[PDB]
Amino acid sequence: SQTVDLSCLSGTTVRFFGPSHHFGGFTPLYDPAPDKRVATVDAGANALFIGGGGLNGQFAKTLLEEAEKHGIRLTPEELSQHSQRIQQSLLRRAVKSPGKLVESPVFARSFGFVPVVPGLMWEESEVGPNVGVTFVHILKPEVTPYGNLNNNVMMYTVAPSGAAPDKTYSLAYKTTIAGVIGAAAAYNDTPAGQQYPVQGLRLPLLGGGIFRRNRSLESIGRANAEGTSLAITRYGPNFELQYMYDPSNAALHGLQEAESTYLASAA
Numbered sequence: 001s002q003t004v005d006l007s008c009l010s011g012t013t014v015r016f017f018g019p020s021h022h023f024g025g026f027t028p029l030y031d032p033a034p035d036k037r038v039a040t041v042d043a044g045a046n047a048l049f050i051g052g053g054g055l056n057g058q059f060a061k062t063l064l065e066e067a068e069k070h071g072i073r074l075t076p077e078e079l080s081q082h083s084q085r086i087q088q089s090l091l092r093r094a095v096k097s098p099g100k101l102v103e104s105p106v107f108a109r110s111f112g113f114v115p116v117v118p119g120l121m122w123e124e125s126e127v128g129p130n131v132g133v134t135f136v137h138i139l140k141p142e143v144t145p146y147g148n149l150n151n152n153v154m155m156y157t158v159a160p161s162g163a164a165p166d167k168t169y170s171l172a173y174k175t176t177i178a179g180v181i182g183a184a185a186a187y188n189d190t191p192a193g194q195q196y197p198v199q200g201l202r203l204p205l206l207g208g209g210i211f212r213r214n215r216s217l218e219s220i221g222r223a224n225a226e227g228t229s230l231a232i233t234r235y236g237p238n239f240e241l242q243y244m245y246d247p248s249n250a251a252l253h254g255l256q257e258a259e260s261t262y263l264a265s266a267a
């Protein structure tokens, strides 16, 4: 990988992952011997379950394998239903106190956050249900990857559908990223976060797989760059960002373009 500090993100340290040893070169969700606590952000489903395909399926696989090792009987069906029930409950609570962080075989503690009520500032029919909601979970020791205490936090976010018009998509995407950064920043100011502070985020290109439909990866990369810059302005460059490997390099390209633009802003 390569790590650089980006001025367009207020000096934030960003780690861009290259291809891994694994099939398809995908970046692992968690490392065996991390020297800091990095929370990986699940590209969640609108229905709020952990399961399915893509990145969400890898979160499911990771939790299930660890449960199996510890003799915990937990099927993919049980994990999907349970995670959905928990996150549905958090969404209900979060929508009743919007803009506030609200607070099991797998979860020790769970948090929810919506920057704004979904569907209130955009069309649900255009971007999709529950867009912008973010959850933070502390994992129980028994399902923590590698039994390492620095791997005990995950996040879960719902991205907008790429089919949406550009104006509403940009708004929805900026809001989603604000929810990710905001939820983590708020988490670190809770009692739970004092004990287990998040020191980095490991990010996919949110909305960039099955959700993007006909939308170009480059437009999403631009949305991510703008959203990330604004979110860091709002909440501060508290922790480092890591972008998981993407052969399109969409997130990288967006930030490169933003960085060069930032250099020229006073000329």
Ligand SMILES: Nc1ncnc2c1ncn2[C@@H]1O[C@H](COP(=O)(O)OP(=O)(O)OC[C@H]2O[C@@H](O)[C@H](O)[C@@H]2O)[C@@H](O)[C@H]1O
Residues within 6 Å of the ligand: 026, 027, 043, 044, 045, 046, 051, 052, 053, 054, 055, 056, 057, 058, 159, 204, 205, 206, 207, 208, 209, 210, 211, 212, 244, 245, 246
């Ligand atoms: N097995 C994997 N391991 C690591 N990274 C992956 C994997 N599969 C996909 N990715 C990367 O994660 C990024 C996120 O893509 P998606 O997971 O498709 O996210 P999104 O398109 O927003 O939709 C997610 C949807 O897929 C389902 O798994 C889940 O139920 C959710 O509804 C993609 O850019 C892709 O490169």
